[PDB]
Amino acid sequence: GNSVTYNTLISGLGKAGRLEEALELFEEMKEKGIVPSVVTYNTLISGLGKAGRLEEALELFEEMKEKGIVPSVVTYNTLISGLGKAGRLEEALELFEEMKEKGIVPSVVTYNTLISGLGKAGRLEEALELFEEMKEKGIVPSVVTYNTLISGLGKAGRLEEALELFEEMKEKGIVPSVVTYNTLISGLGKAGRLEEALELFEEMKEKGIVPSVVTYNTLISGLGKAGRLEEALELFEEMKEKGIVPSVVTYNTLISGLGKAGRLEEALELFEEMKEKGIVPSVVTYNTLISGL
């Protein structure tokens, strides 16, 4: 047993999940003073990552550094992924800087990862810039990345820039996720801009993706306060003739907007129809029927 034996053996242990034994195997691949392969390090360290075991992985990465062994994307990208899941962002950005300083090219999933991170930790403006580096060196922003920026801006209330990133999204060709559109919906909705919203709902239902219940709900909430009851009923019987389950929020909304605009009976049979589908009639609905008699 020299080298590649050990390595493939580790390929097997690794895939089997028998990792501690692999680490110990490394201990015997080191005690007698031997050098493993970059492949081995990659896999072993990847396992180290997946199973949380991160710091040891870093130390082994440094050990690899003192061995002259050159990392390779998936290596770094892993490290990064690890540090990111644990939110140790800045250190990972540091190592990423090391990466680009040693000539190795950050991938797309790389930036995607960083951005996932920095977005999660809110520091957005630091990351938009990473993303713009990302375009300036060519690498295509996958839907992941974009949607990240989108949710970011969304909760940050930059609004406009996002829509730009959104209308430069579809134009670039890539497909806008569902979560995207529903979040955008939250965007325009909060701002109470029904028009541009609904038209983006038109722009989404025309591309082959299906709106979540949340979209409907909020939409008809905005409309719920907007007094355009009719088109809301339209979207909600459409909701029926689309399959989506009307949440208690939605039903309570319609019934409240109907409780805002009299009609009475329709809402009562809507209340029956609400029960027949199994639901928890919230007291606010009841009080809605109170404030209308």
DSSP-assigned letters across all residues of the chain: --SHHHHHHHHHHHHHT--HHHHHHHHHTTTTT----HHHHHHHHHHHHHTS--HHHHHHHHHHHTTT----THHHHHHHHHHHHTT-HHHHHHHHHHHHHTTPPP-HHHHHHHHHHHHHTS--HHHHHHHHHHHHT-----HHHHHHHHHHHHHHT-THHHHHHHHHHHHHTPPP-HHHHHHHHHHHHHTT-HHHHHHHHHHHHTTT-PPPHHHHHHHHHHHHHHT-HHHHHHHHHHHHTTTPPPPHHHHHHHHHHHTTS--THHHHHHHHHHHTT-----HHHHHHHHTT-
Domain that holds residue 104: 1-293
Instruction: Return the residue matching tokens 């090391």.
Output: 98
Instruction: Return the residue matching tokens 């493939």.
Output: 8
CB-based contact 82:54 (threshold 8 Å): yes
For the chain, the C-alpha Rg in angstroms (whole number) is 27
Tokens (6 digits) for 270: 């809507």
Nearest alpha carbon to residue 58 among 31, 98, 18: 98
Q: How far apart are CA 102 and CA 231, in angstroms?
A: 59
Nearest alpha carbon to residue 155 among 131, 119, 199: 119
Please tell me the total count of domains within the chain: 1
**Do you know the residue count of the chain?**
293
Resolution in A: 3.7
Tokens (6 digits) for 63: 């050990």
Which method resolved this structure? Answer: X-ray
User: Would you give the distance in Å from CA 48 to the centre of its chain?
Assistant: 24
In Å, what is the CA distance from 210 to each residue of 16, 179, 187, 204, 216? Answer: 39, 10, 18, 8, 11
